[PDB]
Design a protein around this ligand. Sequence first.
Ligand SMILES: COc1ccc(-n2nc3c(c2NC(=O)C2(c4ccc(Cl)cc4)CCCC2)CS(=O)(=O)C3)cc1
Length: 469
Amino acid sequence: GASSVHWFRKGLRLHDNPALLAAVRGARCVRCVYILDPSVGINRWRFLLQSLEDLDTSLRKLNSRLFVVRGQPADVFPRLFKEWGVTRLTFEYDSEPFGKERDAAIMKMAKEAGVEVVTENSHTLYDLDRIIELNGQKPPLTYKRFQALISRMELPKKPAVAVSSQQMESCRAEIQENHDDTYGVPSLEELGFPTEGLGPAVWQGGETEALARLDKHLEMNANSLLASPTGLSPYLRFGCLSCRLFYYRLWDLYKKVKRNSTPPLSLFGQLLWREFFYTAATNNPRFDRMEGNPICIQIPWDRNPEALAKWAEGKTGFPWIDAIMTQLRQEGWIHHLARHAVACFLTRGDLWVSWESGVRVFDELLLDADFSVNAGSWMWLSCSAFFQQFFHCYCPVGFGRRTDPSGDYIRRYLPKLKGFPSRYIYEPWNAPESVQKAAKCIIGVDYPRPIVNHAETSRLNIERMKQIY
Ligand SMILES: COc1ccc(-n2nc3c(c2NC(=O)C2(c4ccc(Cl)cc4)CCCC2)CS(=O)(=O)C3)cc1
C-alpha cells in the first residue's frame, strides 16, 4: 500500500481531517509531519507548541508519533520523499496568497517525484473559489453581498469522521529510539524564548483543549472583557477546532433550544465574517498593504514612530487603551469591542497611523489573527475597504466607561491605577492631586499623561476622512 505523509500547517487536529483520512486510506504507512521554519510573540509560539504537543500525544494513543521537522518545505520534502519512500502527500488547503504559491511549488515538485498529492479545504466552511465564481470572478466587497451568495450555496460539508484506531494500527510507522532527539516538539527555550516566571497560559493550545471548550461553549461587563473558558477563536485560527464541527454543533443547539430548525445567519456571524475575509484575501497578495491593494482606499496616514510604539506597548496614557493593549500582549486575546476601541484610536480616531502598522502589531500578539482576518478587520475598522457607510465614534474614555463602569478591567491589567475611584479611572489626569497621591499614582510620573488631546485630534481626523470620501 501507500507510504503517506500528512502535512500539518493549520488543521492541527485529528477530527474533521479529510486530508488525513485520504493519507490513511489504503496505506501501509502514514507519518504526520509539522515543518518548523527557522516579529512573532511568545503567546503565538507557545500556543503552536502546545497544539503540536497535543497532536503528538494524540498520535501516541494511535501507536504513532508526530514528526516535527526543521527547515523549509522546499528543501525538506525532497529529502523526506527519498528517505521515507513517500508515495502520497496530503495536507489541508491554504487559501492565503503566500501559502497558495508555496503549496503550488510543493505539488509541482511532488508530481515530478511521482508522489500523489491530495488536498482538502476543511479550514473554511465553503469553497472560497466557488463564491468568487458566482460573483462574476471577483470576491464580494460587502458583507451583505457575501451573505446573499452563500445563502444560495449548498450548506457546508458536515465534519468528517476522525481516523479510527484500527486504521492507524494498520499503518503504524517505525519509531526510532531517538525520535524525540530528531523529531520532538521543541520547547520555548529551544525556539529562543527564555521563560522568566511565565504562568499557565490563559489560552492552552491544542485540539483536546479545543474540544473541551466547545462542549462548555454549547452549554457586556468587566467579566465579558476577560478571557472566557468557552472562547474558541484561537482554536479556529490554528485549526485545533474544525469550523464545520462548530457550525453544525451550533446549529444542533439552536434547534434544541428554539422551535425553528432555521436559524438566522447572525448565529454564525463570527464564522461568516471569518469566511468573508478569507474569500476577499485569497486572490490578493497585497491584502495586508495599502499601496497596490486594489480594494484599499489610499489614505495619507501619518508616520509617527513614537505614538505607534506607545500604542503598541500600552503607554498612551488612556487607561482603557493601555489596559486592552496590556491584555493583548500578556494573553493573546482581547474582546471585539476592545479591538474596535484600540484600532480606532490608532487609525481614524486619534493617531492617524496606518492600519497596516496595526496589522503588524496584532500579527505579533493576537492568537486568532491571520493574514486574511487581521488585515480584513483593520481595513474594515479604519474605513479603508468594504464600502464603509459611517464612521463609528469610540471615545477612548467614554466607550470604556460604558463597557465597564466598575473600572475593574483597568484595575486588573493596570494595577498601578488600582486605587483610582471609578469616576476617575478612565481619565486619571482629571483626578485632583489628593486623589492621585491616595492612589499612590502621580500622573506624569507613575503612569503617563494622555499623549493626545482626544477632543481636538478626533475633530481634525473626522473631517479628513470626510474630505477623503
Ligand atoms: C482591527 O483588528 C482586528 C479586529 C477584529 C479581528 N477579528 N478576529 C476574528 C474576527 C475578527 N473581526 C470581526 O469579527 C469583525 C470586526 C472587524 C473589526 C473590529 Cl475592530 C472588530 C470586529 C469584521 C467586521 C465586523 C466583525 C472574526 S473570526 O473568527 O473570524 C476571529 C481581527 C483584527
